[PDB]
Design an enzyme around this catalytic site. Sequence first.
Site, PDB file in Angstrom:
ATOM      1  N   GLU A  14       0.820  -1.205   0.000  1.00  0.00           N
ATOM      2  CA  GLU A  14       0.000   0.000   0.000  1.00  0.00           C
ATOM      3  C   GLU A  14       0.854   1.255   0.000  1.00  0.00           C
ATOM      4  O   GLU A  14       1.880   1.319   0.676  1.00  0.00           O
ATOM      5  N   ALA A  16       0.693   5.890  -0.669  1.00  0.00           N
ATOM      6  CA  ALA A  16      -0.019   7.086  -0.258  1.00  0.00           C
ATOM      7  C   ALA A  16      -1.401   7.120  -0.906  1.00  0.00           C
ATOM      8  O   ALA A  16      -2.387   7.432  -0.236  1.00  0.00           O
ATOM      9  CB  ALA A  16       0.779   8.327  -0.643  1.00  0.00           C
ATOM     10  N   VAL A  20      -2.022  -2.142  -3.571  1.00  0.00           N
ATOM     11  CA  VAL A  20      -1.759  -3.112  -4.628  1.00  0.00           C
ATOM     12  C   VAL A  20      -2.275  -4.491  -4.216  1.00  0.00           C
ATOM     13  O   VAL A  20      -1.979  -4.941  -3.110  1.00  0.00           O
ATOM     14  CB  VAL A  20      -0.249  -3.143  -4.961  1.00  0.00           C
ATOM     15  CG1 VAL A  20       0.065  -4.194  -6.019  1.00  0.00           C
ATOM     16  CG2 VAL A  20       0.230  -1.768  -5.410  1.00  0.00           C
ATOM     17  N   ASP A 121      12.093   7.801  -6.241  1.00  0.00           N
ATOM     18  CA  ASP A 121      11.936   7.139  -4.944  1.00  0.00           C
ATOM     19  C   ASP A 121      12.553   5.742  -4.946  1.00  0.00           C
ATOM     20  O   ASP A 121      11.909   4.788  -4.526  1.00  0.00           O
ATOM     21  CB  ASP A 121      10.459   7.121  -4.488  1.00  0.00           C
ATOM     22  CG  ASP A 121      10.225   6.830  -3.001  1.00  0.00           C
ATOM     23  OD1 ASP A 121      11.180   7.005  -2.196  1.00  0.00           O
ATOM     24  OD2 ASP A 121       9.086   6.419  -2.644  1.00  0.00           O
TER      25      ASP A 121
HETATM   26  C1  LIG Z   1       3.605 -16.077  -6.825  1.00  0.00           C
HETATM   27  N1  LIG Z   1       3.539 -15.176  -5.682  1.00  0.00           N
HETATM   28  C2  LIG Z   1       3.873 -13.876  -5.643  1.00  0.00           C
HETATM   29  C3  LIG Z   1       3.687 -13.451  -4.345  1.00  0.00           C
HETATM   30  C4  LIG Z   1       4.035 -12.109  -3.761  1.00  0.00           C
HETATM   31  C5  LIG Z   1       5.392 -11.889  -3.159  1.00  0.00           C
HETATM   32  C6  LIG Z   1       5.082 -11.274  -4.494  1.00  0.00           C
HETATM   33  C7  LIG Z   1       4.802  -9.788  -4.538  1.00  0.00           C
HETATM   34  O1  LIG Z   1       4.653  -9.138  -3.507  1.00  0.00           O
HETATM   35  N2  LIG Z   1       4.707  -9.275  -5.789  1.00  0.00           N
HETATM   36  C8  LIG Z   1       4.433  -7.954  -6.176  1.00  0.00           C
HETATM   37  C9  LIG Z   1       4.444  -6.870  -5.299  1.00  0.00           C
HETATM   38  C10 LIG Z   1       4.196  -5.583  -5.823  1.00  0.00           C
HETATM   39  C11 LIG Z   1       4.207  -4.426  -5.014  1.00  0.00           C
HETATM   40  C12 LIG Z   1       4.021  -3.171  -5.535  1.00  0.00           C
HETATM   41  C13 LIG Z   1       4.147  -1.947  -4.639  1.00  0.00           C
HETATM   42  C14 LIG Z   1       5.583  -1.411  -4.619  1.00  0.00           C
HETATM   43  C15 LIG Z   1       5.675  -0.137  -3.784  1.00  0.00           C
HETATM   44  N3  LIG Z   1       5.212  -0.416  -2.378  1.00  0.00           N
HETATM   45  C16 LIG Z   1       5.483   0.754  -1.390  1.00  0.00           C
HETATM   46  C17 LIG Z   1       4.568   1.936  -1.702  1.00  0.00           C
HETATM   47  C18 LIG Z   1       6.945   1.239  -1.435  1.00  0.00           C
HETATM   48  O2  LIG Z   1       7.345   1.570  -0.101  1.00  0.00           O
HETATM   49  C19 LIG Z   1       6.287   1.292   0.815  1.00  0.00           C
HETATM   50  C20 LIG Z   1       5.382   0.311   0.091  1.00  0.00           C
HETATM   51  O3  LIG Z   1       5.923  -1.002   0.263  1.00  0.00           O
HETATM   52  C21 LIG Z   1       3.796  -0.938  -2.340  1.00  0.00           C
HETATM   53  C22 LIG Z   1       3.665  -2.199  -3.202  1.00  0.00           C
HETATM   54  C23 LIG Z   1       3.795  -3.057  -6.908  1.00  0.00           C
HETATM   55 CL1  LIG Z   1       3.609  -1.482  -7.618  1.00  0.00          CL
HETATM   56  C24 LIG Z   1       3.750  -4.150  -7.728  1.00  0.00           C
HETATM   57  C25 LIG Z   1       3.955  -5.445  -7.207  1.00  0.00           C
HETATM   58  C26 LIG Z   1       3.959  -6.636  -7.972  1.00  0.00           C
HETATM   59  N4  LIG Z   1       4.185  -7.837  -7.488  1.00  0.00           N
HETATM   60  C27 LIG Z   1       3.206 -14.585  -3.680  1.00  0.00           C
HETATM   61  N5  LIG Z   1       3.119 -15.633  -4.479  1.00  0.00           N
END
Ligand SMILES: Cn1cc([C@H]2C[C@@H]2C(=O)Nc2cc3cc(C4CCN([C@]5(C)COC[C@@H]5O)CC4)c(Cl)cc3cn2)cn1
EC number: 2.7.11.1
Length: 262
Positions: A14, A16, A20, A121
């Site tokens: 998540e 601001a 996601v 960032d």
């Molecule tokens: C097969 N399998 C996959 C999984 C999950 C582990 C895999 C995962 O988390 N994938 C993932 C995560 C993603 C997170 C983000 C965001 C980045 C930025 N942060 C922040 C705003 C920055 O700093 C603070 C906040 O953490 C929020 C979230 C986005 Cl844009 C796209 C994403 C795509 N894919 C489990 N089983």
Amino acid sequence: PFVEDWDLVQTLGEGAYGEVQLAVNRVTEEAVAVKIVDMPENIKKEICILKMLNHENVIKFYGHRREGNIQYLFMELASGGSLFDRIEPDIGMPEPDAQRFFHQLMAGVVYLHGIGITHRDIKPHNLLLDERDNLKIADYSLATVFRYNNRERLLNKMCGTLPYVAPELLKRREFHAEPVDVWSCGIVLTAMLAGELPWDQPSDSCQEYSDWKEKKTYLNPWKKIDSAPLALLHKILVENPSARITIPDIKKDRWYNKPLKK
Ligand SMILES: Cn1cc([C@H]2C[C@@H]2C(=O)Nc2cc3cc(C4CCN([C@]5(C)COC[C@@H]5O)CC4)c(Cl)cc3cn2)cn1
């Protein structure tokens, strides 16, 4: 929840504006990450920038849908998690893994800078890994255009995460985009190699930053770092952004080109 032809099952993170989630299509079973944004001209800029993106070390943008106030942003699921979750506190990671991740981060930052885009960032939470451990730069909510028609625009907006921001954001009215992105990459390198951040913020009021400028590398996290990567860090983490190393010159550094494995 169910929207059009997707099933939002797992919360991935998540920011601001919005959050996601994991969306596995009820029809084709394709797993994607959806940024669900409730409600300005900032989402117009985000979807726009995301369209321009086509690189192996930059998160895949699929498209965008809507539901009145609720916006839907489609992205590649980075099935390997984030770089933050691969850094062990007070230790970091094996230097050969850090170098490979740093090469892939430079390949992504070079691409973005080449298309006139600045991420603004860069930190481990925004650097995701795929199935093969390929680094992908994620989250363009703070990304801005710094070059258009071969003409560079200076930045003035202060944004990012204090431990990763370059000192010129806090001291200058206007500043160049590329060195700010270079500085955050050096903080990410410091984190990968020592599992610890050097300072709360790069200011004259902060003791750990004063210690670095007084060349006290006999202190943490610098003493956990080998002399070769530390020599590179002495070139990246330079206060005056006009004297800081550029990416073409990081590509000529000894540690950057040092053969490693195991
Ligand atoms: C097969 N399998 C996959 C999984 C999950 C582990 C895999 C995962 O988390 N994938 C993932 C995560 C993603 C997170 C983000 C965001 C980045 C930025 N942060 C922040 C705003 C920055 O700093 C603070 C906040 O953490 C929020 C979230 C986005 Cl844009 C796209 C994403 C795509 N894919 C489990 N089983």
